[PDB]
CSV table of C-alpha atoms and ligand atoms in Angstrom, one decimal:
chain,number,residue,atom,x,y,z
A,4,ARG,CA,106.7,100.6,125.1
A,5,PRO,CA,103.4,102.3,126.2
A,6,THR,CA,100.4,100.6,127.8
A,7,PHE,CA,97.8,99.7,125.2
A,8,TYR,CA,94.0,99.3,125.6
A,9,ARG,CA,91.5,97.5,123.4
A,10,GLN,CA,88.0,98.8,122.4
A,11,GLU,CA,85.5,97.9,119.8
A,12,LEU,CA,84.0,100.6,117.6
A,13,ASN,CA,81.5,99.7,114.9
A,14,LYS,CA,82.6,96.1,115.1
A,15,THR,CA,86.2,97.0,114.5
A,16,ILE,CA,88.9,96.4,117.1
A,17,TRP,CA,91.1,99.3,118.1
A,18,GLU,CA,94.1,98.7,120.1
A,19,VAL,CA,95.8,102.0,121.0
A,20,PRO,CA,98.2,103.5,123.6
A,21,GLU,CA,96.5,105.1,126.6
A,22,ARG,CA,97.6,108.6,125.6
A,23,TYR,CA,94.9,108.4,123.0
A,24,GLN,CA,91.4,108.8,124.7
A,25,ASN,CA,87.7,109.4,123.7
A,26,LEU,CA,87.9,107.4,120.5
A,27,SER,CA,85.1,108.5,118.2
A,28,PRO,CA,84.3,107.1,114.7
A,29,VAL,CA,84.5,109.6,111.9
A,30,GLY,CA,85.1,107.3,108.9
A,31,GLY,CA,91.2,101.8,106.9
A,32,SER,CA,88.8,103.4,109.3
A,33,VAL,CA,89.3,106.7,111.2
A,34,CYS,CA,88.7,107.7,114.8
A,35,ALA,CA,88.9,111.1,116.4
A,36,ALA,CA,90.7,111.0,119.7
A,37,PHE,CA,92.1,113.2,122.4
A,38,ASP,CA,95.8,113.1,122.7
A,39,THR,CA,96.5,113.4,126.4
A,40,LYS,CA,100.2,114.1,125.7
A,41,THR,CA,99.8,117.4,123.7
A,42,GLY,CA,96.2,118.2,124.7
A,43,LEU,CA,95.0,118.2,121.1
A,44,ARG,CA,92.4,116.4,119.0
A,45,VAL,CA,93.9,113.9,116.5
A,46,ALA,CA,92.7,111.5,113.9
A,47,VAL,CA,93.8,107.9,114.3
A,48,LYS,CA,93.5,105.8,111.2
A,49,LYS,CA,93.6,102.0,111.5
A,50,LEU,CA,94.6,100.6,108.2
A,51,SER,CA,92.2,97.9,107.0
A,52,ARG,CA,93.8,94.9,105.4
A,53,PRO,CA,97.4,96.1,105.6
A,54,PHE,CA,99.3,93.1,104.4
A,55,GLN,CA,96.6,91.0,102.5
A,56,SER,CA,98.3,91.1,99.1
A,57,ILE,CA,101.6,92.2,97.7
A,58,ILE,CA,99.9,95.1,96.2
A,59,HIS,CA,98.4,96.1,99.6
A,60,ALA,CA,101.6,95.4,101.5
A,61,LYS,CA,103.4,97.8,99.1
A,62,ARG,CA,100.7,100.5,99.4
A,63,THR,CA,100.8,100.3,103.2
A,64,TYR,CA,104.6,100.9,102.9
A,65,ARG,CA,104.1,103.7,100.4
A,66,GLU,CA,101.6,105.4,102.7
A,67,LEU,CA,103.9,105.3,105.7
A,68,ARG,CA,107.0,106.4,103.8
A,69,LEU,CA,105.0,109.4,102.3
A,70,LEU,CA,103.5,110.4,105.7
A,71,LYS,CA,106.9,110.2,107.4
A,72,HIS,CA,108.5,112.5,104.7
A,73,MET,CA,106.0,115.4,104.8
A,74,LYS,CA,107.3,118.2,106.9
A,75,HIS,CA,105.6,121.3,105.7
A,76,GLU,CA,102.8,123.7,107.1
A,77,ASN,CA,100.4,123.0,104.3
A,78,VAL,CA,101.0,119.2,104.0
A,79,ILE,CA,99.6,116.8,106.6
A,80,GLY,CA,102.6,115.1,108.3
A,81,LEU,CA,102.8,112.1,110.7
A,82,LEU,CA,102.2,112.8,114.4
A,83,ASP,CA,102.6,109.2,115.5
A,84,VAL,CA,102.6,105.7,114.1
A,85,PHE,CA,102.2,102.6,116.2
A,86,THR,CA,101.4,98.9,116.3
A,87,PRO,CA,100.1,96.7,119.2
A,88,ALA,CA,102.8,94.2,118.0
A,89,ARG,CA,106.0,93.7,120.0
A,90,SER,CA,108.3,91.9,117.4
A,91,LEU,CA,108.0,91.6,113.6
A,92,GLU,CA,106.3,88.2,113.8
A,93,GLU,CA,103.2,89.6,115.7
A,94,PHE,CA,103.1,92.6,113.4
A,95,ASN,CA,99.7,92.8,111.7
A,96,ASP,CA,98.1,96.2,112.3
A,97,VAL,CA,99.3,99.7,111.5
A,98,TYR,CA,97.8,102.9,113.0
A,99,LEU,CA,98.7,106.4,111.8
A,100,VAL,CA,98.1,109.5,113.9
A,101,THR,CA,97.6,112.8,112.3
A,102,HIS,CA,96.1,116.4,113.2
A,103,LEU,CA,92.4,116.4,113.1
A,104,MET,CA,91.6,119.6,111.2
A,105,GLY,CA,87.8,119.6,111.7
A,106,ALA,CA,86.5,120.5,108.2
A,107,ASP,CA,87.3,119.9,104.6
A,108,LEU,CA,87.2,122.4,101.7
A,109,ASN,CA,84.1,120.6,100.5
A,110,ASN,CA,82.1,121.3,103.7
A,111,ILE,CA,83.4,124.9,103.6
A,112,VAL,CA,82.1,125.9,100.0
A,113,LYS,CA,78.6,124.5,100.7
A,114,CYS,CA,78.1,127.1,103.4
A,115,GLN,CA,80.4,130.2,103.2
A,116,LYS,CA,80.2,132.0,100.0
A,117,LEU,CA,83.9,132.7,99.9
A,118,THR,CA,85.3,136.2,99.6
A,119,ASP,CA,88.1,137.1,97.2
A,120,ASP,CA,90.6,137.3,100.1
A,121,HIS,CA,89.6,133.8,101.2
A,122,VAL,CA,90.2,132.4,97.7
A,123,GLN,CA,93.7,134.1,97.6
A,124,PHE,CA,94.6,132.6,101.0
A,125,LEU,CA,93.2,129.2,100.3
A,126,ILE,CA,94.7,128.8,96.8
A,127,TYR,CA,98.0,130.3,98.0
A,128,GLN,CA,98.2,127.6,100.7
A,129,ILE,CA,97.4,124.8,98.3
A,130,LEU,CA,100.1,126.1,95.9
A,131,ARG,CA,102.7,126.5,98.7
A,132,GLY,CA,102.1,122.9,99.9
A,133,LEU,CA,102.3,121.8,96.2
A,134,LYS,CA,105.6,123.6,95.6
A,135,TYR,CA,107.0,121.5,98.5
A,136,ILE,CA,105.4,118.2,97.4
A,137,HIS,CA,106.5,118.6,93.8
A,138,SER,CA,110.1,119.5,94.9
A,139,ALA,CA,110.3,115.9,96.4
A,140,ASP,CA,109.3,114.6,92.9
A,141,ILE,CA,106.0,113.5,94.3
A,142,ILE,CA,102.7,114.0,92.4
A,143,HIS,CA,99.5,114.3,94.4
A,144,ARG,CA,97.5,112.8,91.6
A,145,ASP,CA,94.0,113.2,93.2
A,146,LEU,CA,93.9,116.8,94.5
A,147,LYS,CA,90.4,117.7,95.4
A,148,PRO,CA,88.4,119.6,98.1
A,149,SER,CA,87.9,116.4,100.2
A,150,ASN,CA,91.7,116.1,100.3
A,151,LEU,CA,91.9,119.6,101.8
A,152,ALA,CA,91.6,120.2,105.5
A,153,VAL,CA,90.9,123.7,106.7
A,154,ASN,CA,90.5,125.1,110.2
A,155,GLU,CA,88.8,128.0,111.9
A,156,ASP,CA,91.3,130.4,110.5
A,157,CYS,CA,91.0,129.0,106.9
A,158,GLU,CA,94.6,127.5,107.4
A,159,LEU,CA,94.8,124.6,105.0
A,160,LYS,CA,96.6,121.1,104.9
A,161,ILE,CA,96.8,118.8,101.9
A,162,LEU,CA,95.9,115.2,102.6
A,163,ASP,CA,97.1,112.0,100.8
A,164,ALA,CA,99.9,113.5,98.6
A,165,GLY,CA,101.5,110.8,96.4
A,166,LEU,CA,99.2,108.1,97.6
A,167,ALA,CA,96.9,107.5,94.6
A,168,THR,CA,84.8,112.1,91.8
A,169,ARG,CA,86.6,112.7,88.7
A,170,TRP,CA,85.7,116.4,88.7
A,171,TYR,CA,89.3,117.7,89.4
A,172,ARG,CA,91.3,115.2,87.3
A,173,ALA,CA,93.5,116.4,84.5
A,174,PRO,CA,92.3,115.4,80.9
A,175,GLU,CA,95.6,113.4,80.3
A,176,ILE,CA,94.7,111.1,83.3
A,177,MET,CA,91.1,110.9,82.1
A,178,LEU,CA,92.5,109.5,78.9
A,179,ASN,CA,95.0,107.2,80.6
A,180,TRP,CA,97.9,108.8,78.7
A,181,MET,CA,101.2,107.0,78.9
A,182,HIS,CA,103.1,108.8,81.7
A,183,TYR,CA,102.2,112.3,82.8
A,184,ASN,CA,103.9,114.8,85.1
A,185,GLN,CA,103.3,117.1,88.2
A,186,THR,CA,101.3,119.6,86.1
A,187,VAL,CA,98.2,117.4,86.5
A,188,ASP,CA,98.1,118.8,90.1
A,189,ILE,CA,97.8,122.4,88.7
A,190,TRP,CA,94.8,121.3,86.5
A,191,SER,CA,93.2,120.3,89.8
A,192,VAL,CA,94.1,123.6,91.5
A,193,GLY,CA,92.4,125.4,88.5
A,194,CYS,CA,89.2,123.3,89.1
A,195,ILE,CA,89.2,124.0,92.9
A,196,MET,CA,89.9,127.7,92.4
A,197,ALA,CA,87.2,128.1,89.9
A,198,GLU,CA,84.7,126.5,92.3
A,199,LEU,CA,85.9,128.6,95.3
A,200,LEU,CA,85.1,131.6,93.2
A,201,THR,CA,81.7,130.7,91.7
A,202,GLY,CA,80.5,128.3,94.5
A,203,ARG,CA,79.7,125.8,91.6
A,204,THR,CA,81.6,122.7,90.5
A,205,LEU,CA,83.5,123.7,87.3
A,206,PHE,CA,83.2,120.4,85.4
A,207,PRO,CA,80.5,118.3,87.2
A,208,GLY,CA,80.6,115.4,84.7
A,209,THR,CA,78.2,112.4,85.0
A,210,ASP,CA,80.7,109.9,83.9
A,211,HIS,CA,84.0,109.8,82.1
A,212,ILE,CA,83.1,110.9,78.6
A,213,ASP,CA,80.7,113.6,80.0
A,214,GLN,CA,83.6,115.0,82.0
A,215,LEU,CA,85.8,115.3,79.0
A,216,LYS,CA,83.0,116.9,77.0
A,217,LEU,CA,82.6,119.7,79.7
A,218,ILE,CA,86.3,120.3,79.7
A,219,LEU,CA,86.5,120.8,76.0
A,220,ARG,CA,83.5,123.2,76.1
A,221,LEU,CA,85.5,125.6,78.3
A,222,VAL,CA,89.0,125.3,77.0
A,223,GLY,CA,88.3,124.4,73.3
A,224,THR,CA,89.5,121.5,71.1
A,225,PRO,CA,93.3,121.1,71.1
A,226,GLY,CA,95.3,123.5,69.0
A,227,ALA,CA,97.7,122.5,66.3
A,228,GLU,CA,100.6,122.9,68.6
A,229,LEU,CA,99.1,120.3,71.1
A,230,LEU,CA,98.1,117.9,68.3
A,231,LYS,CA,101.8,117.8,67.0
A,232,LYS,CA,102.8,116.2,70.3
A,233,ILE,CA,100.3,113.4,70.3
A,234,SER,CA,102.1,110.3,69.2
A,235,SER,CA,99.2,107.8,69.3
A,236,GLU,CA,97.3,107.7,66.0
A,237,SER,CA,93.9,106.7,67.5
A,238,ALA,CA,94.0,109.4,70.2
A,239,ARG,CA,94.7,111.8,67.4
A,240,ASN,CA,91.3,111.1,65.7
A,241,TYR,CA,89.3,110.3,68.9
A,242,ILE,CA,90.2,114.0,69.2
A,243,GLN,CA,89.5,115.5,65.7
A,244,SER,CA,86.2,113.5,66.2
A,245,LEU,CA,85.0,114.9,69.5
A,246,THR,CA,83.0,118.1,68.6
A,247,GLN,CA,85.0,121.1,67.2
A,248,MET,CA,84.9,124.0,69.8
A,249,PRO,CA,86.7,127.4,70.4
A,250,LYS,CA,88.3,128.4,73.7
A,251,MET,CA,85.9,130.3,75.9
A,252,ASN,CA,87.0,133.7,77.2
A,253,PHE,CA,87.4,133.1,81.0
A,254,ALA,CA,86.8,136.9,81.5
A,255,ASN,CA,83.3,135.9,80.2
A,256,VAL,CA,82.9,132.8,82.3
A,257,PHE,CA,84.0,134.0,85.7
A,258,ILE,CA,82.1,137.4,85.6
A,259,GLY,CA,82.8,139.6,88.7
A,260,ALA,CA,85.9,137.6,89.6
A,261,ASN,CA,89.1,139.6,90.3
A,262,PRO,CA,90.9,140.0,86.9
A,263,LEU,CA,94.2,138.5,88.4
A,264,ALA,CA,92.2,135.4,89.5
A,265,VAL,CA,90.8,135.0,85.9
A,266,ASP,CA,94.3,135.5,84.5
A,267,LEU,CA,95.8,132.8,86.8
A,268,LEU,CA,92.9,130.4,86.0
A,269,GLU,CA,93.8,131.0,82.3
A,270,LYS,CA,97.3,129.8,83.1
A,271,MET,CA,96.3,126.8,85.0
A,272,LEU,CA,93.4,125.4,82.9
A,273,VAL,CA,95.4,124.7,79.7
A,274,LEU,CA,95.0,121.3,77.9
A,275,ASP,CA,98.7,121.2,77.0
A,276,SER,CA,100.5,120.2,80.2
A,277,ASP,CA,103.8,121.8,79.1
A,278,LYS,CA,102.1,125.2,79.1
A,279,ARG,CA,100.4,125.0,82.5
A,280,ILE,CA,101.9,127.4,85.2
A,281,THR,CA,104.0,125.6,87.8
A,282,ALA,CA,103.4,125.7,91.6
A,283,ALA,CA,106.5,127.9,92.1
A,284,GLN,CA,105.6,130.3,89.3
A,285,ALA,CA,102.0,130.6,90.5
A,286,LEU,CA,103.1,131.6,94.0
A,287,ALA,CA,104.9,134.5,92.3
A,288,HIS,CA,101.7,135.5,90.5
A,289,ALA,CA,100.2,139.0,91.2
A,290,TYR,CA,97.0,137.5,92.6
A,291,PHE,CA,98.9,136.3,95.9
A,292,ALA,CA,100.9,139.5,96.4
A,293,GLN,CA,99.4,139.9,99.8
A,294,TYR,CA,100.6,136.5,100.8
A,295,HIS,CA,103.7,135.5,98.8
A,296,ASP,CA,106.9,135.4,100.8
A,297,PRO,CA,109.8,133.9,98.8
A,298,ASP,CA,111.7,133.4,102.0
A,299,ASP,CA,108.9,131.3,103.4
A,300,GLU,CA,107.9,128.9,100.7
A,301,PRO,CA,110.2,125.9,101.5
A,302,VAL,CA,111.2,122.8,99.5
A,303,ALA,CA,111.3,119.2,100.6
A,304,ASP,CA,114.3,117.0,101.4
A,305,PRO,CA,114.8,114.4,98.8
A,306,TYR,CA,112.4,111.5,98.8
A,307,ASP,CA,113.8,108.1,98.0
A,308,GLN,CA,111.2,106.4,95.9
A,309,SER,CA,113.2,103.6,94.4
A,310,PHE,CA,110.9,101.2,96.2
A,311,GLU,CA,108.2,102.0,93.6
A,312,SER,CA,110.1,100.0,91.0
A,313,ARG,CA,110.5,96.9,93.1
A,314,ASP,CA,108.4,93.7,93.2
A,315,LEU,CA,108.7,92.2,96.6
A,316,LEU,CA,107.1,89.4,98.6
A,317,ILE,CA,104.5,90.3,101.3
A,318,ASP,CA,106.8,89.5,104.1
A,319,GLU,CA,109.5,91.8,102.7
A,320,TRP,CA,107.1,94.8,102.3
A,321,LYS,CA,105.9,94.0,105.8
A,322,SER,CA,109.4,94.0,107.3
A,323,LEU,CA,110.2,97.2,105.5
A,324,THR,CA,107.1,98.8,107.0
A,325,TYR,CA,108.0,97.4,110.4
A,326,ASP,CA,111.5,99.1,110.1
A,327,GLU,CA,109.8,102.4,109.3
A,328,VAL,CA,107.6,102.1,112.4
A,329,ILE,CA,110.5,101.5,114.7
A,330,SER,CA,112.7,104.3,113.1
A,331,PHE,CA,110.0,106.9,113.5
A,332,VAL,CA,111.0,110.1,115.4
A,333,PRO,CA,108.0,112.3,116.5
A,334,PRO,CA,107.8,116.0,115.7
A,335,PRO,CA,109.2,118.6,118.3
B,405,LIG,C1,91.2,116.5,75.4
B,405,LIG,C2,92.6,116.0,74.9
B,405,LIG,C3,93.6,115.9,76.0
B,405,LIG,C4,94.9,116.6,75.7
B,405,LIG,C5,95.7,116.6,77.0
B,405,LIG,C6,97.1,116.6,76.6
B,405,LIG,C7,97.8,117.5,77.5
B,405,LIG,C8,98.8,116.8,78.3
B,405,LIG,O1,99.9,117.5,77.9
B,405,LIG,C9,100.8,116.6,77.3
B,405,LIG,O2,101.1,115.8,78.5
B,405,LIG,C10,102.3,115.0,78.4
B,405,LIG,C11,102.6,114.7,79.8
B,405,LIG,O3,101.5,114.0,80.4
B,405,LIG,C12,103.5,115.8,77.7
B,405,LIG,O4,104.6,114.8,77.5
B,405,LIG,C13,103.1,116.4,76.4
B,405,LIG,O5,104.2,117.1,75.8
B,405,LIG,C14,101.9,117.4,76.7
B,405,LIG,O6,101.4,118.1,75.6
């Protein structure tokens, strides 16, 4: 068991192994550090109240299980996980170590006007990461530029897959909607991609209803085919009672965009989820021909998420988390 040291950063106590030096607050809470073992910068996240409620204990476990599963180039994976605690009984704090990428896609759009080649490369990588996440039957659920780390070479990693602004949220989630599927992530990609092209937020809503109104201005009120699938009576007139609008021609909205980019946007930004392109299909779209390699777009091992159905006591979630900490095997 390594030697730990204690330090206080912004009135928070960090107790970490010595291998991690130069702790520096970036935002539980996150510290940048220097990993003397690999000679790289890392982010060390101390979880805040890991075991305070059943709901919290379960989400701490969820977070760890997810991070331990992710083994893909475009998905952030777990570099280390540790606790000061010897024994389960002293177990109270959880720290997660990941690659510090240095910028997010949000910081990047506000400076660089992005070229078409950059948008191909950036969206390609998001989709390649999503093909992997979705093959483990995981939904990101909150894909957005702040969840996208990008380095000097515009190489990209997806943060927080499966863990959860409303600007990138699919309409079905904005309206609650009993049960939705992985296609909500593709709506998000459409929103990101549009903004990487124009430099502007696609649907910068003020609140919830304003968001929905902007979405309908672009894509139009639902067609008869979508309305047939809507089982709830009230949702059905809450609809036929928002302002009647036609679908805009995206060729006319994203002027001066590559026509293949406009075509793929048309296939992502569809109200009806059943008709949205999938991550795998998109990777095969003519827009990424420079980047697509069918032999290098891997799928995930299966992810056992049965725990999601269970209602356990804080102590049990806590012991399950402790088992995961102990069983952790670091990457090559
Ligand atoms: C503005 C009105 C919102 C319409 C959004 C409905 C599109 C979501 O699409 C719907 O999603 C469900 C899964 O979530 C599917 O079971 C339905 O078949 C599909 O039409």
